[PDB]
Ligand binder design. Structure first.
Ligand code: CA
Ligand code: CA
Ligand code: CA
Ligand code: CA
Ligand code: CA
Ligand code: CA
Ligand code: CA
Length: 155
């Protein structure tokens, strides 16, 4: 499908070959797709405890031809979804802790001094004017402050 072709174009040949090796390990009978039986089996062998309904939910999430099983191109979609979700999570979680730390007076906002120290502590030389412009551009609602959602969006 459309979506399977996008997922593949996102991955290197090298990643795809590593995913095919894992897929071949789920596909216990070599038949070409992962069943409910097979998915639960390796999930339980990796210390997970899914319910049958959770096994069904996972399959249906990527099950584009309605077979009730996962073929390799569907597997690759499950993998790209997981990576992008990981990545997105890691970034927000890190920027949340950066905002926390450099909001040194704990008023809930980042001002131009605090913003200038984020950049210096990061090892990037920035000018005062650079900082004040980022402040301006970043201040979307024009209250003169940078709140968290403006911070996120700015970085
Ligand atoms: Ca199989
Ligand atoms: Ca459980
Ligand atoms: Ca079902
Ligand atoms: Ca259903
Ligand atoms: Ca399928
Ligand atoms: Ca502050
Ligand atoms: Ca603002």
């Amino acid at each position: 499908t459309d979506q399977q072709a996008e997922a593949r174009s996102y991955l290197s040949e090298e990643m795809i070959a590593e995913f095919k090796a894992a897929f071949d390990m789920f596909d216990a009978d070599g038949g070409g797709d992962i069943s409910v039986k097979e998915l639960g089996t390796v999930m339980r062998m990796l210390g997970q405890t899914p319910t049958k309904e959770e096994l069904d939910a996972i399959i249906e999430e990527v099950d584009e031809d309605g077979s009730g099983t996962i073929d390799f191109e569907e597997f690759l979609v499950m993998m790209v979804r997981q990576m992008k979700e990981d990545a997105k999570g890691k970034s927000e979680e890190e920027l949340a802790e950066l905002f926390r730390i450099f909001d040194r007076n704990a008023d809930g906002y980042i001002d131009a001094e605090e913003l200038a120290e984020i950049f210096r502590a990061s090892g990037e030389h920035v000018t005062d004017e650079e900082i004040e412009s980022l402040m301006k551009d970043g201040d979307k609602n024009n209250d003169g402050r940078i709140d968290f959602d403006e911070f996120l969006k700015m970085m």
